[PDB]
Design a protein around this ligand. Structure first.
Ligand SMILES: N=C(N)c1ccc([C@H]2[C@H]3C(=O)N(Cc4ccc5c(c4)OCO5)[C@@H](Cc4ccccc4)[C@H]3[C@@H]3CCCN32)cc1
Ligand SMILES: [Ca+2]
Length: 223
């Protein structure tokens, strides 16, 4: 996260780190046994780490649970990142508590200008690299269709939205991928892509989770 702030330990209790001997992506807990992340975060050997604040230190409240399955959207396209969403089933259910909690799926898409919370352990530098130990937060508005498509002509599908700031300095970034964009208590977005981080007129692009609620529920129900 670039231009963000220290969230505070466990203030984002649905926030998850995907780990494979290191942090590589974020995710969101949507029930005790399922996490939502990005398809480009797919890999084998995923350990899900819940209740994390300092990802480099065992502080208490952590739960490490291996993924039993990782389900990439069958229509995911790695070239364009359309359908950049993945479901991860945990080997065992998480124990839910104040510090480990699910985030609600939306019942309606969000509108332009809606303010959302974006969080992650990704790079905190627009240029260069600095990865934080503790969770970073960023408040960001959802941008208009035209703005978004103007930012990235022919690159924006109906399964994508822009959120962020056109003036630069505040964006999601590397390491934040697959993490949540939560608006009014609903998971509306997944960190998907962008051109660099926090560059002027190049805002963050996010998977439009409201288009996948049916898919999400049918897939979970069948697995
Ligand atoms: N500025 C951002 N908020 C931001 C967030 C995530 C990433 C990710 C993804 C990314 O940029 N990919 C490359 C890419 C570029 C253009 C494009 C794409 C994909 O599909 C349609 O058009 C990929 C990941 C990459 C993994 C490390 C962080 N990157 C980038 C910027
Ligand atoms: Ca920790």
């Amino acid at each position: 996260i670039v231009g963000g702030y220290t969230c505070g330990a466990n203030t984002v209790p649905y926030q998850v780190s995907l780990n494979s001997g290191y942090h590589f992506c974020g995710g969101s807990l949507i029930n005790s046994q399922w996490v939502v992340s990005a398809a480009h975060c797919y890999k084998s050997g995923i350990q899900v780490r819940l209740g994390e604040d300092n990802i480099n230190v065992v502080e208490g409240n952590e739960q490490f649970i291996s993924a039993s399955k990782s389900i990439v959207h069958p229509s995911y396209n790695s070239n364009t990142l359309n359908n950049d969403i993945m479901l991860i089933k945990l080997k065992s259910a998480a124990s839910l508590n104040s510090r480990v909690a699910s985030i609600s799926l939306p019942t309606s898409c969000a509108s332009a200008g809606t303010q959302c919370l974006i969080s992650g352990w990704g790079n905190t530098k627009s240029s260069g690299t600095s990865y934080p130990d503790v969770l970073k937060c960023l408040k960001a508005p959802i941008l208009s269709d035209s703005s978004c498509k103007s930012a990235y002509p022919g690159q924006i599908t109906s399964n994508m939205f822009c959120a962020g700031y056109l003036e630069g300095g505040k964006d999601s970034c590397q390491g934040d991928s697959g993490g949540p964009v939560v608006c009014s208590g609903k998971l509306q977005g997944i960190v998907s892509w962008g051109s660099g981080c926090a560059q002027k007129n190049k805002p963050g692009v996010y998977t439009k989770v409201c288009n996948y609620v049916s898919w999400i529920k049918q897939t979970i129900a069948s697995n």
